[PDB]
């Protein structure tokens, strides 16, 4: 039986969300690509380049008009007439608009596509702009994080294939399943927060006992994600477990909320 067409495009980005996706432990990204979806365009992985890649893009968005999922990594820059990000000699934004017009639904992978991420941090030299300020007539599912958790990305994809519908979202368009609760509301160091048991300098005795990272700038109290529950890299760790406070990397504007080491 045919697999759901997916077109994956890349604006200004660092490719972390693509790398996250391929870390998926269950299902393996191999099995997502071979058996669950038809990944029909993706600059990172596809054989074709140049005019052969342009032909794939055109062929898929034409033949599967109205029927493909558009995955977007990164964002369009409005500066220099969009030519801070060029594809096939034209502004990236034109490729984003063409791909968006034929899509059934749009997944905004990562904080870049969702909100702006590092290139939109002050002073935003390129005028990098999240997808939902350019595409205003299509369902957009925001999957924020820098990058989002590998097994969250694959679980969102399996949900859509298995249940044949988009995940239910909060008022910001984030899937309730993984973004409904704050990091701090499922943090294994919360006992120490509640007791006033804090790391005060790196590698102090508190740090060596896994005390709370609030006074070291942890932004877990204002960050919605699944890092303290689902965790990272097949459950191996997450930022706080390995001794660094949450940066707040799933939240809009997290680069410009003051130092990562200044308290929430």
């Amino acid at each position: 039986k045919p697999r759901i067409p997916v077109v994956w495009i890349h604006g200004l980005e660092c490719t972390c969300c693509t790398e996250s996706f391929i870390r998926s432990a269950h299902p393996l990204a191999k099995d997502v690509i071979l058996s669950l979806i038809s990944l029909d365009y993706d600059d990172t992985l596809m054989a074709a380049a140049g005019t052969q890649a342009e032909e794939v893009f055109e062929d898929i968005i034409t033949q599967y008009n109205g029927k493909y999922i558009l995955a977007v990594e990164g964002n369009p820059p409005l500066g220099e007439q969009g030519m801070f990000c060029i594809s096939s000699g034209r502004p990236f934004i034109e490729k984003l608009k063409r791909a968006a017009a034929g899509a059934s639904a749009i997944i905004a992978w990562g904080t870049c596509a969702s909100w702006g991420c590092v290139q939109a941090a002050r002073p935003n030299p390129t005028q990098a702009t999240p997808i939902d300020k350019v595409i205003t007539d299509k369902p957009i599912i925001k999957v924020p994080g820098c990058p989002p958790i590998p097994d969250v990305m694959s679980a969102i994809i399996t949900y859509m294939v298995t249940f044949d519908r988009l995940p239910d979202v909060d008022r910001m368009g984030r899937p309730l399943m993984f973004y409904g609760q704050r990091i701090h509301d499922k943090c294994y160091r919360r006992a120490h927060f509640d007791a006033g048991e804090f790391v005060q300098s790196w590698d102090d005795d508190a740090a060596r006992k896994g005390y709370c990272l609030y006074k070291m700038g942890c932004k877990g109290p204002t960050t919605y994600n699944a890092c303290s529950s689902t965790r990272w890299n097949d459950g191996v760790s997450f930022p706080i477990q390995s001794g660094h406070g949450c940066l707040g990397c799933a939240e809009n504007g997290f680069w410009d909320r003051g130092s990562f080491y200044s308290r929430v």
Partner: protein, 581 residues
């Protein structure tokens, strides 16, 4: 049309123009243009970075302690290496020395990233230039088993396995949804593997896609997550507790046990899957030991990496050597000084930036990142480029030079520097590899050689992972647990004005971050990244960079199918987000 001579090349832009935009199976955005003569030989090559974000502008006014987290996001492929260069730069500026275990763990993070990046590049990015995936459907599974077992002890070689892999591919293409294989170059005459080697390589593509996720569990233990692990100025945040109450809140014996399990599996995969596959691509593609030389027989550059003596970045400490060769004189490996204003400079006469004088180079402590999109007299228009004008500005990539010379960086560059400095392990490895191919040492200075060196380095880094792990455990056995220096963590302890250099060898080559701190804030932050070097545009002398030189003089079988262009560009592992930052 014009013609000029540089570096032994005749740069001639008469004749048919070919455009490859987008370049795929890279990180980020690249455009390539070439001219080919009547004989389908490239006479001109144009490297264009088609993205910019401006991290060097964004870092102004930030707290130096935060900088690593911003610049880590230069790249998610070489994830971590910019964080490492950043903490090195800020520590160099302020005068911070980290504890030994922090240095060992940073060396583990870097070796982990070498293994991961090199393996994924080999299979997922470059592999399909060499392996004809659709030709794998014609293979005999028993002859594929026999081939694989002739090359390797790797267990996964049964005829039934290769049949099962082949049937998975047959099922994948049966509905006409070829996905990443659609409209590929399959059947091009430059595909030289027999069907059984295609099926062996395709099986390994899938094994490598699965296995690479395990390697980065080492980043998750010490750095919280991958991509984009966490670091600190002063060491690492992953406090260690082996034998005291609350070890469940720290790097403990169970966490170290997980790291050891990953190291062994990573070495085993690289040694028994990637190494024999690289040699097999060599055996079937020996002509590519003479294609894509470019600068690799002229000018190569390494800063060096992996300081084994904590806080000592000198030649006696760095396990991966540094040095520069120019003028094809590999008898004279020159020392590199990243503070010397006459050594590393960047030019922008052919890039989309403003300088007060675009006919001179600026050392990064004098660097300027003032973006200026001005493609001038293109064919087409400024928002619809049909042909870049390489006689004027044609890239978001600055043009780095070393003492005015255009250099190649990356695994081949490092291998040549280490070989010619007499590093015993490098000389042994390279000699054994080129002996197995019956090729002269000069065969490594090529597109094929860049791939062979990358595989050699994955093996090197997997061995170093064990060495560093054992050093860490030796310290713990001695009661040496420290992972952070915090006596200069607070801004009031810093010099009011200071500057520093942080440097390393990222998977793609020589990386430097130059930082100036004033009044507790970043005053200047300039990055020169390995793909900046390799993908460089021209300079005021018209000297070409490593990609443009490696493409020069290349024969194309079918002008409309850029397989040979992709082979040579992919051999450098282009990281365009890195190159432009």
């Amino acid at each position: 049309s014009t013609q000029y001579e540089t570096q032994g090349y005749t740069i001639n832009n008469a004749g048919r123009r070919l455009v490859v935009d987008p370049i795929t199976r890279i990180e980020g955005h690249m455009r390539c243009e070439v001219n080919i003569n009547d004989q389908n030989v490239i006479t001109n090559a144009v490297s264009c970075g088609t993205m910019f974000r401006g991290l060097e502008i964004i870092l102004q006014g930030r707290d130096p302690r935060d900088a690593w987290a911003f610049v880590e996001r230069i790249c998610g492929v070489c994830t971590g290496v910019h964080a490492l260069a950043s903490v090195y730069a800020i520590e160099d500026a302020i005068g911070i020395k980290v504890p030994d275990n922090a240095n060992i763990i940073r060396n583990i993070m870097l070796a982990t990233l070498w293994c991961h990046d090199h393996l994924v590049h080999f299979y997922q990015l470059a592999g399909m230039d060499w392996i004809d995936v659709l030709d794998a459907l014609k293979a005999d599974p028993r002859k594929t088993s026999e081939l694989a077992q002739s090359l390797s002890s790797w267990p996964k070689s049964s005829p039934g396995y290769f049949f099962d892999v082949q049937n998975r591919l047959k099922k994948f293409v049966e509905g006409g949804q070829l996905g990443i294989f659609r409209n590929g170059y399959w059947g091009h005459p430059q595909y030289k593997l027999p069907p059984e080697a295609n099926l062996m390589g395709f099986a390994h593509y899938l094994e490598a896609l699965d296995f690479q996720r395990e390697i980065v569990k080492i980043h998750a233990v010490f750095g919280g997550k991958n991509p984009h692990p966490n670091w600190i100025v002063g060491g690492m945040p992953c406090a260690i507790n082996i034998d005291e109450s609350g070890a469940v809140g720290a790097v403990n014996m169970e966490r170290l046990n997980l790291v050891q399990s990953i190291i062994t599996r990573t070495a085993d995969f690289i040694n028994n899957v990637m190494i024999p596959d690289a040699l097999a691509i060599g055996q079937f593609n020996k002509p590519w030991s003479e294609i894509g030389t470019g600068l690799s027989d002229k000018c190569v550059l390494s800063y060096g990496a992996f300081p084994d003596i904590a806080n000592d970045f000198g030649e006696k400490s760095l396990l991966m050597p540094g040095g520069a060769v120019i003028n094809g004189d590999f008898n004279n490996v020159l020392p590199v000084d990243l503070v010397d204003p006459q050594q590393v400079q960047e030019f922008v006469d052919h890039a989309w930036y403003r300088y007060p004088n675009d006919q001179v180079g600026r050392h990064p402590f004098d660097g300027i990142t003032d973006p200026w999109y001005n493609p001038g007299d293109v064919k087409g228009s400024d928002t619809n480029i049909q042909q870049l004008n390489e006689q004027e500005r044609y890239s978001w990539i600055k043009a780095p030079r070393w003492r005015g010379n255009a250099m190649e960086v990356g695994p081949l560059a490092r291998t040549l520097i280490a070989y010619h400095k007499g590093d015993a392990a490098t000389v042994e490895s390279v000699d054994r590899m080129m002996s197995a191919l019956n090729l002269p040492l000069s065969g490594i200075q090529s597109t094929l050689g860049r791939i062979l060196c990358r595989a050699h380095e994955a093996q090197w880094a997997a061995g170093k992972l064990q060495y560093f792990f054992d050093k860490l455990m030796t310290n713990l056995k001695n009661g040496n647990l420290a992972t952070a220096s915090t006596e200069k963590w607070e801004p009031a302890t810093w010099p009011t004005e200071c500057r520093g250099v942080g440097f390393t060898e990222a998977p793609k080559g020589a990386l430097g971050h130059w930082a100036a701190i004033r009044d507790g804030k970043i005053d200047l932050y300039q990055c020169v990244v390995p793909t900046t070097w390799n993908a460089s545009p021209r300079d005021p002398k018209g000297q070409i960079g490593a990609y443009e030189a490696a493409l020069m003089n290349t024969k194309m079988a079918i002008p409309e199918q850029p397989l040979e262009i992709l082979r040579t560009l992919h051999s450098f592992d282009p990281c365009l987000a890195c190159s432009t930052h």
